[PDB]
């Protein structure tokens, strides 16, 4: 389909809980090494701000994708 979305769900699958579970934002940064841009500090940082579901760096694993594609 597309990066951003498919890429990011495939990213998630490194450190996913189980679907509408939680990610570890840092693990997320690690996961991106599987994609192409390992330690994409900016691309992650950009998403880090969106990854604020709690008030820290917890994101609903699925809901994340919805924020990735902030359109």
C-alpha positions as MATLAB code, in Angstrom:
seq = 'XXXXXXXXXXXXXXXXXXXXXXXXXXXXXXXXXXXXXXXXXXXXXXXXXXXXXXXXXXXXXXXXXXXXXXX';
ca = [
       0.000    0.000    0.000;
       2.192    2.868    1.289;
       4.861    3.948    3.660;
       3.846    6.019    6.485;
       0.955    3.655    7.111;
       2.017    0.120    6.146;
       5.657    0.921    7.009;
       4.608    2.176   10.425;
       2.330   -0.817   11.184;
       5.222   -3.089   10.119;
       7.466   -0.860   12.343;
       5.086   -1.378   15.246;
       5.201   -5.177   14.782;
       8.750   -5.099   16.272;
       7.561   -3.802   19.718;
       3.767   -4.138   19.451;
       1.541   -5.235   22.301;
      -1.395   -6.850   20.479;
      -3.661   -4.331   18.679;
      -5.150   -1.360   20.551;
      -2.439   -2.151   23.120;
       0.492    0.167   23.875;
       3.821    0.937   22.225;
       7.139    2.015   23.653;
       8.025    5.186   21.715;
      11.736    4.408   21.999;
      11.296    0.814   20.749;
       9.363    2.516   17.909;
      12.566    4.446   17.012;
      14.406    1.118   17.113;
      11.732   -0.512   14.878;
      12.332    2.094   12.173;
      15.792    0.453   11.715;
      13.876   -2.457   10.147;
      12.421    0.000    7.594;
      15.157    2.136    6.080;
      15.916    5.151    8.302;
      17.537    3.650   11.470;
      17.289    6.119   14.382;
      15.290    8.649   12.363;
      15.640   11.058   15.250;
      13.608   13.813   13.490;
      10.937   11.587   11.972;
      10.534    9.899   15.350;
      10.716   13.256   17.341;
       8.021   14.594   15.004;
       5.885   11.550   15.885;
       7.064   11.688   19.577;
       4.930   14.818   19.945;
       1.917   13.028   18.382;
       2.699    9.989   20.601;
       1.344   11.826   23.702;
      -1.862    9.778   24.291;
      -1.157    9.482   28.037;
       1.096   12.478   28.862;
       4.589   10.994   28.296;
       5.325    8.464   25.494;
       2.506    5.904   25.668;
       0.499    5.530   22.439;
      -2.351    3.165   21.641;
      -0.597    0.785   19.172;
      -3.385    1.099   16.546;
      -4.505    4.700   17.252;
      -0.867    5.719   16.582;
      -1.337    5.042   12.858;
      -4.295    7.460   12.933;
      -1.923   10.172   14.249;
       0.963    9.180   11.878;
      -1.484   10.137    9.146;
      -2.615   13.369   10.755;
      -4.789   14.228    7.666;
];
